[PDB]
Design a protein around this ligand. Structure first.
Ligand SMILES: NC(=O)c1ccc[n+]([C@@H]2O[C@H](COP(=O)([O-])OP(=O)(O)OC[C@H]3O[C@@H](n4cnc5c(N)ncnc54)[C@H](O)[C@@H]3O)[C@@H](O)[C@H]2O)c1
Ligand SMILES: NC(=O)c1ccc[n+]([C@@H]2O[C@H](COP(=O)([O-])OP(=O)(O)OC[C@H]3O[C@@H](n4cnc5c(N)ncnc54)[C@H](O)[C@@H]3O)[C@@H](O)[C@H]2O)c1
Ligand SMILES: NC(=O)c1ccc[n+]([C@@H]2O[C@H](COP(=O)([O-])OP(=O)(O)OC[C@H]3O[C@@H](n4cnc5c(N)ncnc54)[C@H](O)[C@@H]3O)[C@@H](O)[C@H]2O)c1
Ligand SMILES: NC(=O)c1ccc[n+]([C@@H]2O[C@H](COP(=O)([O-])OP(=O)(O)OC[C@H]3O[C@@H](n4cnc5c(N)ncnc54)[C@H](O)[C@@H]3O)[C@@H](O)[C@H]2O)c1
Ligand SMILES: Nc1ncnc2[nH]cnc12
Ligand SMILES: Nc1ncnc2[nH]cnc12
Ligand SMILES: [K+]
Ligand SMILES: [K+]
Ligand SMILES: [K+]
Ligand SMILES: [K+]
Lengths: 461, 462, 462, 461
């Protein structure tokens, strides 16, 4: 008689369980942490507030934390990212979860609340698991006293890490944090190879468009932009790349991409005259990957080739000026998370109008909105890092430290390279890869232990 | 012409070398941009730079840039097979002391470094060092330690040379401060990776003219050089397998689409023939070592390799392959310069029609420089623009003239600031015709950077 | 008004299907160009076409193009899993008889074909046939031979159907002429290859959401479908091995950078379990059959496959995989529609946490159409423009109206002329924005072609 | 004291022999035929005039032919394609060969002449092996009385095949021929994969230019154009493709290339106004692959980006209007087969002029001119077909038949598919590939013999 959740359809739990069982065979690092740590129960008594995409992969993460002794109460960090059978399976296991695919903003900011409050009172939470920093923000500003019992926050993504480092610089961060993103088994796995898998996947599911031979413009060439560009280029697209970082632009050139700017001479003065109309008039598909604001602006959207696809794979929907398109253009729903944006006006539309754009997931995270996000074997690395980060902070009860000792521990640091390598070895084992052991002679030559770490912290891989 | 302070293979190659020098200048905008940017300031006036790095056309553009800013130099190559004789001829014909030629013996190599160190039998008044691998750096610390009292810094190019400096620094035996030129993003993630992608299959084609598509390759190491080497072979259609001791690099090889294997059963190298995965090695048509380690392609692996397999090394030193074992036990038949068939049938001669042989390239030396020309000019543009920036910073620092307390604080191993790394990258992108977008002021505050950059924290790995 | 001559899953999906048809029209310029050129002339006025091909959004544009040119049609799908229900709904809502839904039983599949053949309990007065796979063609010859007396021709879509036509032709059992639509270059070297490149990994991801990069795949066959399938997996970062019986196709797989292996030791399929390369198959994460042959992934191969490997088929018929053996001996657990875990522990029941299972996609049926949506519109544009041209040509020839003596001289299986193949390609290129260069008169005279084409002899293989 | 030859340096013979022994290990199909037919000696009494690039690969072909009883007198079919160590080894073997790298046009015709005449009188030749049709043309126009003794011609390449068909169409072909080019183990192997290997190889040896990130234009997308485009794209170049054939242009699009024309709207009206100056101003490398005439014309050369590389990989140099460049621009030789073309004027040049183009091999076949052509393991397929074709035509004895019997056999034909398959099988085994054998039921199911042929003659692979 468990009555403490809200999902789309609880009858999907059996289907979710079947896909969870499959996902466990695809996540050896996360499941290896189950077998290695099951005995000592390091999260015994941990009460975790969790806000991250309620997918099948997150379901395995949740059950791993619970299997090690923790209690959790969960919601998604995006309105379109939940897999309804995953949320159903989690609720059926007696775990508080408040998520469904296709939430509104009111239902979104309410689901996060249902995790925060238990019977109208603050849950005795002592850990925070976040993806994007939204949950972290709500606690700091609306319930600032709850954080005096919390031993730390483990943040998943680049946007959340940057926002935390704002507070570390400004002195408003109330607990230490783990930069889970900057583990190599995360940033160079999740952010790059994950988007390589799921970008073209989501574009195919949404539109079924042939990609080979067509022109694409990728905004950004960081970790997500590198994977996004590869996802399209391996499909045969002609991919152009935009960047504000010259180093990332250099890699794009060396990787075989033409580097262009949406603006003449790269200067964005806000006018239509700044737009390279000849370039934008050739683009069949534009993808924003920046984590920045307004990188696909209104003037770009006016200049795009007719029937071009527009989508965002960055964390927030403000990469594209969707607000401009709501106010001025008529939206025609093709199917859930697929809209035709008619540039002829907003007072209705001609069903056979040829001057439209196709927007995916209403500008939200396209891989999770129009598909299922990253596959299990990639998220295995990110969530194994997530569990170890929860272990590191909970075993080092910062909230129980005296005030004088707190200052040395207050930081937003990564995990030690040893843990990063241990996650990597389990991932390599999943592929059947065989890592070579250094001889004692070889380890001395290059100056490392046979047991690692094998690189200085300055190494970039 | 009256000037005899050099030794090259053939001075008459200068005109040919000069013609290729002019072409390479058009391919190196960042280096040429520094030449024009600082010429009116002569930032290297008074600098007397000892240089030890492959005497290619690309190095000549670096050298003539250094001279253009006011420096005097005396140069040698850091490998016996890597010198382009027409590049050395043009440098010597320009009045620049250079001692390098293709096909040096071991003794001539050691002799060439000293001819730069000594002028007219006595030590030259050097004050700067440019080194690639640390051989010249080590020779100064060991055999000419008094010269280091007047030298203001070392700019080290490659990973192996950097490793030696960090050891001396930890030992307290390093005498002058150094700049890690290797770990600039416009060097390590450009030279080491993309350079080997261009030049690895380039060197293999020149040495053997072998079809690479459809054949099996084993790449030991998946660092920057291992990544680029594996891509150089995979893009030609090779079936590439990767070996690694670093599980993080091994994870990247899997995700990049390679099967990760070990030459030893379960990865355990206990020194026995029984430890060799004879089934795996018996399938390999080509083996490339990229680690910067010793004996990663060992004697038992050579015995187990498929007949007529190609063996080469692209790490700095030739000890990655047990070539001493092959010189001792098997007969060498030269096909052509830097290409030898190594007959595994015995020591005393060979059947001219023998089928059981291996092909070793560049006698184990750097195969891209030994059998081809190394990295193209446009890639070395980033690495050598960092060299000029590194030389300027340390020369304008005057370490040898600082107080003792100041000496101790700056006897470090540093890189270049990220701002200069970005400025180098910006010029290379413009060389491709790329256009970098400028942030708006509202966007720059949103992501917490300057509109002018730097755009990433120092922790960023790219 | 009162239209009931159809059977679909859900008529309320019609508005959704109409929206996707309007999108697909913008993606199929060759087919829509044919619709606009010929609509006013009504070249298919009086044509009555029995159609049997995957009731997809793409087929819907084909259907409405034939109708726009004046034909009447009665349609069914040629596979039980390939129908898109919103496409079938939109066609039925347009007043076109269509009998197709996703998830038909074998009984319902036969019934749907019959409902096209029969109108109100008696044979429809059909005079044209459009087929994909030859099922409708076989039923007409075996069960309704009198209907063929009034039929002017068959236009066959795929390789398997063309093989069945040639067997009937040489046995003297083919009653009407046919056009081999498959062997247009804008069909074979477009649909069969690039179409499977797009949709193979698409279907695997939708069915399993498995990571593909770094895993091992075995592709049986290296024809057009096998070439496109191997690329679909290799571009995702899979380690792809290829099996073939044709040495020429095997040679291409090698030159394309794949290792060519056989499921059987030395390639000898002696029917015993001992002939299976257990070590090879114990490493395979994914096996794809692309042959159009029978039992190319047999029971002994399925017993030897690595645990949790995915098994799927993209050839036309499901007998490429011995699924009957798996039905007879192993327990099936449905994950979701067209995704089954097959537990090799026994027939009667299974452990929910059993680790020894295989994942079968689409029950061995066409995986791209079964677990995804088949080829994209812009690719199917080439194939279906050929279909319209073939229907027009055979209908205008009026074979059925000829005397018996004339029918014998006209009875053949033919391909479309190269000139039409080229005009289809030109519209496809314009759809991408490509600009074809025009020969000068001297250039055309130099290579011996007309300025307007055709540009290649009929022997050219492209 | 046999001196019936003409080479550059006979002392290079030992080097050529060392590389010939290696090359023989790379050519199992060619060596396999040499071992198979040695006993019968099918070419005993054959007297072959041979005209094809004197490479190491050609050396293995020549030595095979002589092993079966044939006598040959050899020449190269290009002035720049000879490997001097291969010609030296052949001459050192007592075989008449007249070839060296860097012949003049007058020397080229002299080398053909030296094979045709023996002691100032026509040789009693009865077989012809040709590459490009140069020897075939000289026989018909200058030595017709000798063709009455010739049994057949085996032609290597597309250009020579095209010339054969026009002679047959005009009734001027005097002897039958076998089109070796259109075997699948030659056309879809030599012409495509060979250029994939040797195009970027030649550009690297000629200029040592970085290719990644730069813009390329490939003229043509036939077999050679397909391999050339991949040769550049696999190096990281941004490749655009030009074609007159829309079907080949369709393949370029689907293969992931942007299809463009040097002329506005693809219309070549002969004026400078028709040149797409914007496109050609951004091209760093142009490669002609057509076998047509003047596909990189003077107006295109005027509009090319400064310092762009120009090279041809078709059979003849007239694909580029090199004659215009000789008349109007000053040529500065960088090194053999590498010339700078200064567009500042004809009379002299500034050594530091920036307005130049880099021409490789003076417009001749760039892979053979600046490198070594196709690798040994690729030429194994082409030359195995040549040996089979020589055996078949010599055993037919066309020159002995009466006129009415001649008329029935005077044609240009290809080798049977069964022999095409047997050559491919040996190539596959060279890679260690294992071909699966059909079961009798499978063979019956698809209607082929267990032995093959496995495809109908209409199949395009
Ligand atoms: N959808 C997913 O699966 C997923 C996964 C991880 C991260 N993300 C999100 O994606 C975003 C990017 O993450 P990342 O790890 O790649 O970050 P990153 O900092 O490594 O890369 C972002 C890049 O965008 C560039 N950029 C910024 N503004 C630009 C502009 N106006 N024009 C061009 N380039 C511009 C920056 O120079 C930078 O190189 C973040 O918001 C992150 O949270 C999404
Ligand atoms: N030839 C060239 O053009 C060129 C250019 C740059 C650098 N290099 C040289 O190449 C070497 C590698 O440089 P890098 O930048 O790639 O260094 P790196 O440290 O980034 O990579 C070396 C890798 O080798 C791996 N490794 C070490 N021992 C191993 C073993 N026994 N088996 C398998 N893997 C092993 C390490 O884990 C490491 O990841 C250095 O010596 C450098 O000087 C050559
Ligand atoms: N699903 C789709 O979208 C789609 C599209 C086109 C064709 N098809 C179907 O796919 C099949 C193949 O079509 P295709 O055009 O590629 O035909 P194809 O003749 O060009 O290719 C089949 C290949 O399989 C090889 N083969 C046969 N038996 C084999 C065996 N036992 N082991 C290994 N290889 C073997 C043959 O040598 C041949 O090369 C046909 O049934 C066709 O109808 C499907
Ligand atoms: N260098 C080598 O190694 C090598 C090898 C084989 C063949 N070849 C030669 O290369 C040439 C091409 O051979 P192939 O087998 O590729 O022939 P092909 O017939 O298959 O291809 C030639 C292509 O050029 C296109 N074309 C013609 N005129 C054009 C124009 N003005 N603009 C653009 N495209 C145009 C045609 O449409 C055709 O697709 C022949 O002369 C052949 O002898 C060279
Ligand atoms: N060609 C080259 N010249 C100089 N330094 C190099 N390092 C690698 N390749 C080089
Ligand atoms: N190596 C080679 N030998 C002869 N002809 C060729 N054509 C292309 N490459 C060749
Ligand atoms: K997923
Ligand atoms: K170079
Ligand atoms: K589709
Ligand atoms: K060669």
């Amino acid at each position: 008689g468990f009555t403490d959740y809200k999902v789309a359809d609880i009858t999907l739990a059996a289907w979710g369980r079947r896909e969870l069982i499959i996902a466990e065979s695809e996540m050896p690092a996360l499941m290896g942490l189950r077998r290695k740590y099951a005995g000592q129960q390091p999260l015994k008594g941990a009460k975790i507030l969790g806000c991250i995409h309620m997918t099948i992969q997150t379901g395995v993460l949740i059950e791993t934390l619970v299997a090690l002794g923790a209690e959790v109460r969960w919601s998604s960090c995006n309105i379109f990212s939940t897999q309804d059978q995953a949320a159903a399976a989690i609720a059926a296991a007696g775990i508080p979860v408040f998520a469904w695919k296709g939430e509104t903003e009111e239902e979104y900011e309410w689901c996060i609340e249902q995790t925060i409050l238990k019977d109208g009172q603050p849950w005795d939470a002592n850990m925070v698991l976040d993806d994007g920093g939204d949950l972290t923000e709500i606690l700091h500003k609306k319930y600032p006293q709850m954080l005096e019992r919390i031993h730390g926050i483990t943040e998943e993504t680049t946007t959340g890490v940057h926002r935390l480092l704002d507070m570390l610089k400004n002195g408003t961060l109330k607990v230490p944090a783990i930069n889970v993103n900057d583990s190599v088994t995360k940033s160079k796995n999740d952010n790059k190879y994950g988007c390589r898998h799921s970008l073209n996947d989501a574009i195919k599911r949404g539109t079924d468009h042939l990609l080979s031979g067509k022109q694409a413009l990728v905004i950004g060439y960081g970790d997500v932009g590198k994977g996004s560009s590869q996802s399209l280029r391996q499909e045969g697209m002609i991919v152009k790349v935009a960047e504000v970082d010259p180093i990332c632009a250099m890699q794009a050139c060396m990787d075989g991409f033409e580097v262009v700017s949406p603006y003449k001479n790269g200067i964005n003065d806000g006018t239509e005259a700044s737009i390279d109309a000849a370039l934008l008039g050739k683009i069949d598909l534009i993808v924003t990957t920046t984590g920045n604001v307004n990188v696909c602006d209104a003037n770009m959207l006016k200049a795009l080739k007719k029937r071009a696809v527009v989508c965002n794979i960055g964390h927030f929907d403000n990469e594209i000026d969707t607000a401009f398109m709501r106010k001025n253009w008529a939206w025609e729903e093709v199917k859930p998370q697929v809209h035709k944006i008619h540039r002829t006006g907003k007072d209705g539309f001609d069903a056979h109008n040829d001057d439209y754009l196709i927007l995916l997931a209403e500008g939200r995270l396209v891989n999770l909105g129009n598909a299922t996000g990253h596959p299990s074997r990639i998220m295995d690395g990110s969530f194994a890092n997530q569990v170890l980060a929860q272990i590191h902070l909970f075993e080092q009860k910062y909230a129980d430290l005296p005030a004088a000792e707190k200052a040395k521990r207050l930081s937003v640091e990564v995990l030690p390279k040893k843990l990063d390598e241990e996650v990597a070895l389990e991932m390599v084992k999943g592929f059947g890869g065989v890592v070579t052991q250094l001889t004692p002679k070889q380890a001395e030559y290059i100056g490392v232990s046979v047991e690692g770490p094998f690189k200085p912290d300055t190494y970039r891989y």
